[PDB]
Amino acid sequence: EAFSSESKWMTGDWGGTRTELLDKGYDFTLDYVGEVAGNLHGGYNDDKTARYSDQFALGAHLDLQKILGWHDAEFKLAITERSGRNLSNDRISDPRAGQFSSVQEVWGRGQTWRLTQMWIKQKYFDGALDVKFGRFGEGEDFNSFPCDFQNLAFCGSQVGNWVGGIWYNWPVSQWALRVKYNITPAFFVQVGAFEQNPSNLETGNGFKLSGSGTKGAIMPMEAVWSPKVNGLPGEYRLGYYYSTAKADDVYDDVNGNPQALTGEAFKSHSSKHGWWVVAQQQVTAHGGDVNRGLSLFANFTVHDKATNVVDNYQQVGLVYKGAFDARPKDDIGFGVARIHVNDDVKKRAELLNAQSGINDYDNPGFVPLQRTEYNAELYYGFHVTNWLTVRPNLQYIKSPGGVDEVDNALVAGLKIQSSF
């Protein structure tokens, strides 16, 4: 401890008192994430600049069994503040049809202070049933995926990205109940009910506890299989979500006519719904070391054609830990994602342009045809200490916002992760 290579905290164990608190059931954490991005070539605006965005996360993890005598119970408090600007908005995107993904995943949801987690959790029958209640985002339990890449498409719950209008990951919180049945040490099922309340997105409501503005509920379900394949760990997720809030059609007006022709309100549907798959698998163990080798990953996502802008999404990638004996804790990442836009969204746009008489893409009143956006990242993670990782990355974006008229973007990124 103190500032050392093997402490998982930069400030160490505070002369022992941190390790005591840990024994007594208290785990206090202060985690930092900084992301830099600068355009090197292409995208909507080719004036070269750089943007920086970051996040602090202050946490309190309580073992309520030691502290209160409550048999496997846990409390968690997390507060975040985020700061900075996003390259995706400021250079890459068409201003009237912004990028779906983002070259700085850590940016978004208001750049302020938020209550990001506040929940109590208890297990029953030797950890067979797991009940969790309080405030958190869907991605924390459902459709969960790590966040080492800088590009949004390869970080966190993807359902949270493409139906992010109602499903809100970290750092947004909402009242929620999540019930989990562990059928087998390597297989579980789970369902949840999340307050769905767009006012949580408004700056000012970073610490909202009231249920005012609730539009309905999101109800995710999931099966998560974590088998060993050839002695190597994998994790496979299959899920479905259902949302009880009203959503607008992407094309039909209230009468079933194309709304681009009428200007009347969109037809309203009483719900949204979709499915997802997450798969991650370690496929090699470098020279017999389980802690090194090649891991593959994939994500697929599918959404209701009626209301969702993103039709479907796919992502494939890999990461190698410890390619070289010299740097056994370093990693190499590569990922490709495809984000397809609901064709009716495009059809509606073609109609708009037809009716405004504006057919030139360079005309501000023209409404870009959104088709398919691709993202790719290649990164290298230096394991500086156990409390510091630094990963430069290279990002490539084909048709930002799905707009073929926007040149491919080459972006340079630097992602930093540290725990104090």
Ligand X SMILES: OC[C@H]1O[C@@H](O)[C@H](O)[C@@H](O)[C@@H]1O
Name the residues that contact ligand C8E, by CB under 6 A: 32, 34, 54, 69-70, 73, 83, 120, 122, 131, 133, 179, 181, 189-191, 221, 223, 238-240, 324, 326-327, 332, 376-380, 392-394, 396, 412, 414, 418
State the sign of the Cα–Cα–Cα–Cα dihedral 190, 195, 197, 201.
negative
The Cα-based distances of 178 to 68, 140, 141, 222 in angstroms read 22, 11, 8, 11
Looking at beta carbons only, is 173 or 385 nearer to ligand X?
Answer: 173
223: partner contacted, choices ligand DMU, ligand X, ligand C8E, none (Cβ within 5-8 A by kind): ligand C8E
Looking at beta carbons only, is 111 or 122 nearer to ligand X?
Answer: 111
Looking at beta carbons only, is 156 or 368 nearer to ligand X?
Answer: 156
49: partner contacted, choices ligand DMU, ligand X, ligand C8E, none (Cβ within 5-8 A by kind): ligand DMU
Distance CA 387, CA 362 (A): 48
Residues that bind ligand DMU (CB under 6 A): 36, 49-50, 52, 124-126, 129, 131, 336, 371-372, 374, 376, 396, 398-399, 404, 408
Q: H or E element: which one contains 116?
A: strand 113-124
25: partner contacted, choices ligand X, ligand C8E, ligand DMU, none (Cβ within 5-8 A by kind): none
Distance CA 171, CA 160 (A): 11
373: partner contacted, choices ligand DMU, ligand C8E, ligand X, none (Cβ within 5-8 A by kind): none
Q: How many CB atoms lie within 10 A of CB 289?
A: 12
168: partner contacted, choices ligand X, ligand DMU, ligand C8E, none (Cβ within 5-8 A by kind): ligand X
Chain centroid to CA 206: 18
Site of tokens 């002369």:
15
Residue nearest to ligand DMU (CB): 404
The Cα-based distances of 399 to 24, 123, 173, 241, 403 in angstroms read 53, 47, 32, 28, 5
Looking at beta carbons only, is 275 or 396 nearer to ligand DMU?
Answer: 396
Residues that bind ligand X (CB under 6 A): 105-109, 156, 160, 168-170, 172
110 contacts 208 by C-beta, under 8 angstroms = no
State the sign of the Cα–Cα–Cα–Cα dihedral 79, 84, 87, 89.
positive
